[PDB]
Tab-separated table of C-alpha atoms and ligand atoms in Angstrom:
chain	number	residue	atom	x	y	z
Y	7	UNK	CA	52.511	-20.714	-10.357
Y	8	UNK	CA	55.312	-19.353	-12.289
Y	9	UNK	CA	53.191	-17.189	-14.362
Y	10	UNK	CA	53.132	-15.360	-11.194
Y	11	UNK	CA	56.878	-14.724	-10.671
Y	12	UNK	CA	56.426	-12.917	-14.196
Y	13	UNK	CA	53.463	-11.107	-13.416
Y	14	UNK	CA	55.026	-9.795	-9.747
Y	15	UNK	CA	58.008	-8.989	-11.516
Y	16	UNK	CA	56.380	-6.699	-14.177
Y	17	UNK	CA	54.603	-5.245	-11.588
Y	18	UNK	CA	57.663	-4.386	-9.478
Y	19	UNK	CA	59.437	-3.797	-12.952
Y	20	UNK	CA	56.878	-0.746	-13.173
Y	21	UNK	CA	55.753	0.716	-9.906
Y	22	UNK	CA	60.070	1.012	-9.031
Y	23	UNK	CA	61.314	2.818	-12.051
Y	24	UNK	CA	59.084	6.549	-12.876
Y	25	UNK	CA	59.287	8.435	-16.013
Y	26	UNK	CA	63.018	8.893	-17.344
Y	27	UNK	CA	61.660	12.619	-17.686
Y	28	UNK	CA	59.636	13.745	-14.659
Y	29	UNK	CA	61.022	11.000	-12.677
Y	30	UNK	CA	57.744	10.674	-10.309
Y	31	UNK	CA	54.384	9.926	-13.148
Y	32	UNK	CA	55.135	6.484	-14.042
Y	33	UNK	CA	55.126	5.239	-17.493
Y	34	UNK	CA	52.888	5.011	-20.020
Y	35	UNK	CA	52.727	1.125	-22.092
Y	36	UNK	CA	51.314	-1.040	-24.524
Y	37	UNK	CA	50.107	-4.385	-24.532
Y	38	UNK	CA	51.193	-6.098	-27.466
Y	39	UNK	CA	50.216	-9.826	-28.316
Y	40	UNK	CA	52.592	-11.857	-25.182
Y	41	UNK	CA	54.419	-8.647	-24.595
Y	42	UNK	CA	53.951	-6.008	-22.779
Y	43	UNK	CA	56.106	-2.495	-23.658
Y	44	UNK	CA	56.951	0.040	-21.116
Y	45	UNK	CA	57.472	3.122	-22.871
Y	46	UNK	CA	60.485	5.030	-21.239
Y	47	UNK	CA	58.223	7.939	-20.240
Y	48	UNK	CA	54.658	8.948	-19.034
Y	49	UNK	CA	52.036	10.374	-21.348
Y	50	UNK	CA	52.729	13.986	-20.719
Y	51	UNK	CA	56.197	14.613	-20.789
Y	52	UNK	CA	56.514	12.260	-23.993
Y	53	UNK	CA	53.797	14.494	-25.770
Y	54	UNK	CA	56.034	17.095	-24.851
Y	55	UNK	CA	59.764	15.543	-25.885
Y	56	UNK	CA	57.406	15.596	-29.009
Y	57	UNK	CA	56.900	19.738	-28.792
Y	58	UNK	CA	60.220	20.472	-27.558
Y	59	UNK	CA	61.790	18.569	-29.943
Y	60	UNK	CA	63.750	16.503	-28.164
Y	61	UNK	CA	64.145	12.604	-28.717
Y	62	UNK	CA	66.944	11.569	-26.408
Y	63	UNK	CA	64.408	10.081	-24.166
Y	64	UNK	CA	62.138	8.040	-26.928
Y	65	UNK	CA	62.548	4.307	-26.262
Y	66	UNK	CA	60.539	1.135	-24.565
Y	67	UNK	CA	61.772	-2.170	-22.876
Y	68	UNK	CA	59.041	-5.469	-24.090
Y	69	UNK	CA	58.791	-7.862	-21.737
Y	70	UNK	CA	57.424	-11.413	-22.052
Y	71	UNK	CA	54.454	-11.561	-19.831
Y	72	UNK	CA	54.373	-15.120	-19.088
Y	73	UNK	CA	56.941	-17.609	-17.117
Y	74	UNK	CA	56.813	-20.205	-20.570
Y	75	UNK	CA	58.548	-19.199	-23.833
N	101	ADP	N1	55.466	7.377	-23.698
N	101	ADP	C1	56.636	7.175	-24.456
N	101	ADP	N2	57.889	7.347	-23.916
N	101	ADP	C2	59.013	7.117	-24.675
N	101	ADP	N3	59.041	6.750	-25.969
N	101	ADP	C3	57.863	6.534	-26.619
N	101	ADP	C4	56.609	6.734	-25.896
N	101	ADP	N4	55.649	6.417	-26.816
N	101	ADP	C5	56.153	6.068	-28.021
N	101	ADP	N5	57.489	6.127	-27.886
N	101	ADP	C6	58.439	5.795	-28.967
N	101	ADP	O1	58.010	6.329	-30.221
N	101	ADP	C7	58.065	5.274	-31.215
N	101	ADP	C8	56.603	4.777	-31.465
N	101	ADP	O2	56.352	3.560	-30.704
N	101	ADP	P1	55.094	2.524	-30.801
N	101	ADP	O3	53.794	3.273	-31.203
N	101	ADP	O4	55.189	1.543	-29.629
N	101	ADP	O5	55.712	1.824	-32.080
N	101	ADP	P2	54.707	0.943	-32.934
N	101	ADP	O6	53.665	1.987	-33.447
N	101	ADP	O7	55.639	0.379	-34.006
N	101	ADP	O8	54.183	-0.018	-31.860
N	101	ADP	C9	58.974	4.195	-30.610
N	101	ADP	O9	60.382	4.482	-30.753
N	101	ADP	C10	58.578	4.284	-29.155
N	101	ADP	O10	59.578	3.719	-28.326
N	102	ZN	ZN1	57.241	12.115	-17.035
């Protein structure tokens, strides 16, 4: 089932690439209708971009989470 390729592929997709931040928590997401977002960073350290002002790390990649368009 090609469904499958996608779903293997998201979860490579996330358990390979941590937090831009911390670099070891991995990142928080979203699931959002056929998409799912992976927020560039993990809860914490996004909270705190939010306290330390900084936004040079804010961001998300969607990804279709399904083989058919
Ligand atoms: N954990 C996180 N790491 C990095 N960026 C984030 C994180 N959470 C939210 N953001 C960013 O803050 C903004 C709010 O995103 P989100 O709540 O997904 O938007 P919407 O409310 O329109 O779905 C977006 O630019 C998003 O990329
Ligand atoms: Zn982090």
């Amino acid at each position: 089932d090609d469904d499958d390729k996608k779903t293997n592929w998201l979860k490579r997709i996330y358990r390979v690439r941590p937090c831009v931040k911390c670099k070891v928590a991995p990142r928080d997401w979203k699931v959002k209708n056929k998409h799912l977002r992976i927020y560039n960073m993990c809860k914490t350290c996004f909270n705190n971009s939010i306290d330390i002002g900084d936004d040079t790390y804010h961001g998300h990649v969607d990804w279709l989470m399904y083989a058919d368009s």
